[PDB]
């Protein structure tokens, strides 16, 4: 049920195009009705496991239709760590 994802996209085809495709994945993510915090290396999402897996998949499909080679680091979590940290406030 309760879960957290930390997503890092890394397009490896063009130039910086790249901060474009990332920007895209970011725009898509903002579109979802999910709690999100953009940190320096990854975008942290919080919500129901089911919705995050769905959003993760879409986020990657978005990135993949902007670059031919997409690599992503993903962190998935469930309980006991932190949501307190979520405090963007910056």
């Amino acid at each position: 049920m309760k879960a957290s994802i930390a997503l890092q996209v890394l397009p490896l085809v063009q130039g910086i195009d790249r901060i474009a495709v990332i920007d895209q994945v970011i725009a898509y993510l903002q579109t979802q009705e999910v709690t999100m915090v953009v940190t320096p290396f990854e975008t942290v999402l919080e919500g129901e496991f089911d919705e995050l897996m769905r959003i993760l998949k879409e986020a990657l499909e978005v990135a993949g239709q902007e670059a031919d080679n997409v690599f992503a680091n993903v962190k998935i979590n469930v309980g006991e760590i932190l949501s307190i940290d979520e405090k963007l406030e910056k």
Copy 2:
């Protein structure tokens, strides 16, 4: 289409309870009709993006029903990606 997923499950639970969530995730994974290689830190899967996302979600649900706190590192590689055989011929 083409996609590769690397999975590492780090359950934040004691001894015996963890060797089980890990055993369970591996067994489940073997159950799928997907190309898989178990390496020292992560289990590497290869196949269609759609099926891997599905398998990833199930793998995590399996792990989550064996421990209350499950953390996972996942690597995704989508698009015109080289195969496990090709990468291994760096």
Copy 3:
């Protein structure tokens, strides 16, 4: 030269005793004269490559002398990279 480390420590210990290795790694990190931001899943450091590698090693040695099993995820970004600030508003 310019570099950025993203540090995440998972102690693999039982409650109270782990959330001590983490306060230990955070405290040590604050001790260094390095730019640092604590995000939900990892602590992001920014500075000279040489100093970060040194701080990373010490941070891990600190964690290791508080738990017998320490696992860490680390992200290294070195070169004509974008500062944390620039990435902030990606």
Copy 4:
């Protein structure tokens, strides 16, 4: 003291060259007198913490002098719970 490292260099550069900076880092790594296994997403090294930190730093400096933007994922393990030595099965 006893430790294990998992390295993944993502040069985020235009095709071909990306496997060149990766091959570079690989050649350097083979040069060290350290136990190593190349898996599909990361190269796993095993040995004394001190030597691995030294090798990691050099590996990255090698990669950085072949591309202007180098990103790396690194996993560090200290202990035995995850029995990384089992990597005899390569």
